[PDB]
Amino acid sequence: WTATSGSCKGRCFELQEVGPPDCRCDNLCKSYSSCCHDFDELCLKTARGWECTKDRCGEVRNEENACHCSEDCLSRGDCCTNYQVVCKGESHWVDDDCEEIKVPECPAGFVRPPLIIFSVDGFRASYMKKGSKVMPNIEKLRSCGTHAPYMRPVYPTKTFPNLYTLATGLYPESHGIVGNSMYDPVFDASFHLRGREKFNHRWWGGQPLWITATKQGVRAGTFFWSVSIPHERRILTILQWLSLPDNERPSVYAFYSEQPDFSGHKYGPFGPEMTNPLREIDKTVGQLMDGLKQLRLHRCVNVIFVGDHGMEDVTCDRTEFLSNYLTNVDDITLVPGTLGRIRAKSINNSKYDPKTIIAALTCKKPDQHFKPYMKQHLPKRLHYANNRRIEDIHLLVDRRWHVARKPLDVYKKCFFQGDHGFDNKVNSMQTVFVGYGPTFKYRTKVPPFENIELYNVMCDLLGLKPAPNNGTHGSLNHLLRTNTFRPTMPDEVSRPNYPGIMYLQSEFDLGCTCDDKVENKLEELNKRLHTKGSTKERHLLYGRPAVLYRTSYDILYHTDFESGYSEIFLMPLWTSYTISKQAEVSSIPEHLTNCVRPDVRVSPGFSQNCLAYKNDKQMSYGFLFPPYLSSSPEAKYDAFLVTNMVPMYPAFKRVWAYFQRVLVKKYASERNGVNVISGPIFDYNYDGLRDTEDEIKQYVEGSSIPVPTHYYSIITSCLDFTQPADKCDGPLSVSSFILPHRPDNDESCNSSEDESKWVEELMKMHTARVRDIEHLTGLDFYRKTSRSYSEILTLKTYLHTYESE
């Protein structure tokens, strides 16, 4: 109930919202149907429109008008945005040359440059270039400020997940808004774009920027707007708030536009009808900037122009139907469209089996346009699993396609020509970032970056301490002229042991054999030097990784590779080696095919054993440093040490062997040498974070050898590829992957073919940031480089995407 007979007189767009059943006058009252009776009359004036004209100049103030051209309007803070242009001979902001803003030029009483966030729904990254002729105000922001060629959204590339990620710095799995529609089984409640359930605070986790500001004594209302308030009135409201007295004035403001998304859905991303919405958004930016210029704030405010996601061509005819795959289609609930989420229609149905649904959806049709996954098997880069609102069964839908339950869903809802939601690495889903103001750099282009990083920067822009989030604070320091955040490297928690030769061969009873009993004072001292670290500067290029948790581990040196060997997990946490452009690939000699050799630096009690693998009929083993890349026949014996062995399903070993035998050498030829760090990952509870020992769900049968959920590799070389990886003077270049360690290759529909036709495609799908590997392993990489730490942070957040131009 609302007692709507209160009044908005003197309260229009009040910042504090009032409590039921008292009527409301804030920018959200329309959404709640709770505005006072006189809200439209008082607060949503439209008389005479949005622009001054010659005849209005110096008019007698008329309180009915939408905005004013009377002489008093500047002191009132309520002139039409074009007032000074029409009436006082001034120029539009867009017509002024840009001049570097070296320092904030702010009116007295301003304690800090305000931040204005201008969010545009569905603003695809390529609009910046393709629409530049019809967006002169945005083009000036972009060219004079700091811009990225594009910004990567989070998955799913839907509105609510992305806007709330912008506000919180968190992945959707952590903030809880994991789609535009959701079912929460604990609440037993549903969330929708339409309706009131979304108003309940229990859906919305983390700490959004307006709450972070408020808690720290910086004024800020929410970033939400009722859809029916026109854009011109939103801008005028922001400009009025900026005229408040110092003690009442917010320091952060948000404008939201439903366009160009609204039209993009109807017309496709590049439909001829799309020009007008782009012109209209530009006009709104022009209004704001002209309004700031009138207030003398245009060289004081930091403005962020940012999108939530892009838009792709999608039509009704490109829909796959689950009813073409499944017999039991009525026993499932599907969340449909550009991603699929499946759960049982009834929790009382005990004949429901996820295993049978997945199999019925796996590689069934030659050109199938979606792939089913258990959520824990989704690429780790999506960070889309650790939330009860994310259904166990997920369908990744190909760009340009929809998935639906049955045909009648699609014609009893062709309307639409655009949609979004797909994998956040898809080119059409990328969106925009431009920062303009005293705190941003001048005419500066920065590399693409992820939207999860912006919360930290917005906090820096406002002098706030960010709540805990998924950005990597410092990785965007290069966007900023000042207010950089100067982080320190995390402290190593566990220091390594450096074992010498401590065990005789006969102390081992591992059930392994090797044909290595074939026997030189010259070369004898040499191999001792190698075991003591003599080649470590070659294979460990950026220092040893730091272990950021409590554990017991050993550093093991070898001619061709160095490793950090876990006495708790019985295998390396990491193995580092460098492969020059000139390296040669060789085979595993016949006599060494089943060779595993005890490591006399490491006790039998802390070693794997071969008998466990003999007995485990499902499980085989592979090596972290590949024997194929040994520097010499004698160095090759080091590759067969029991301390370089890791458990691998035979189906995985097809993937791993091709990576090690073919692809490492290919990258080293292409990149002029590579340094590789490889290792296991254990993430049995799919939270994106390193498992403790007591969280391991699977062991090699009969043993304490834990089975990894994934294997990673970090592949580093010189950004200037005229320099070899091992003698690089400048910035680095990296690509990484986190490959799922799976007992079948059902994910790769072409897996019956030669690895040359499917393995690299799998690895591209499972591309990762070094930071993702850091979270999953508790390791900290690149501790010793010649580079600034902020630059290293940017490198650790890099994702190699394998998308074209």
Ligand SMILES: *[C@@H]1O[C@H](CO)[C@@H](O[C@@H]2O[C@H](CO)[C@@H](O[C@@H]3O[C@H](CO[C@H]4O[C@H](CO)[C@@H](O)[C@H](O[C@H]5O[C@H](CO)[C@@H](O)[C@H](O)[C@@H]5O[C@H]5O[C@H](CO)[C@@H](O)[C@H](O)[C@@H]5O)[C@@H]4O)[C@@H](O)[C@H](O[C@H]4O[C@H](CO)[C@@H](O)[C@H](O)[C@@H]4O[C@H]4O[C@H](CO)[C@@H](O)[C@H](O)[C@@H]4O)[C@@H]3O)[C@H](O)[C@H]2NC(C)=O)[C@H](O)[C@H]1NC(C)=O
């Ligand atoms: C991305 O960044 C984020 C933010 O930094 C990272 O997420 C953090 O990860 C931490 C570790 O997983 C986690 O720390 C836990 O906090 C628990 C207290 O939780 C509440 O308070 C915080 C702080 O205000 C709040 O943010 C939480 O909000 C979550 O939950 C509500 C719903 O209740 C949601 O509205 C909200 O969206 C959010 O949900 C997400 O997180 C939860 C987990 O907290 C998930 O379950 C959801 O799926 C969703 O993703 C909470 O309201 C604290 O209780 C935990 O302590 C337990 O574990 C420790 C280990 O130190 C153990 O020693 C303790 O004994 C304790 O265990 C006890 O409870 C167990 C479970 O019942 C039981 O089994 C035991 O036997 C014990 O009794 C824990 O320290 C932190 O909450 C989140 N923060 C956020 C905002 O998500 C995230 O990891 C980053 N991602 C990556 C990939 O890096």
Ligand SMILES: O=C(Cn1cnc2ccc(N3CCN(C[C@H]4CCOC4)CC3)cc2c1=O)NCc1ccc(Cl)c(Cl)c1
């Ligand atoms: O504004 C809109 C449409 N719209 C319109 N009216 C609404 C009315 C009420 C609410 N509630 C949400 C939960 N709220 C608690 C907050 C405070 C702490 O936790 C979240 C209470 C207010 C929402 C809306 C709403 O969304 N779309 C753009 C947009 C802009 C910014 C973001 Cl971050 C997002 Cl996700 C979307």
Ligand SMILES: [Ca+2]
């Ligand atoms: Ca959107």
Ligand SMILES: [Ca+2]
């Ligand atoms: Ca984990």
Ligand SMILES: [Cl-]
């Ligand atoms: Cl109303």
Ligand code: NA
């Ligand atoms: Na076996």
Ligand code: NA
């Ligand atoms: Na297959």
Ligand SMILES: [Zn+2]
């Ligand atoms: Zn949309």
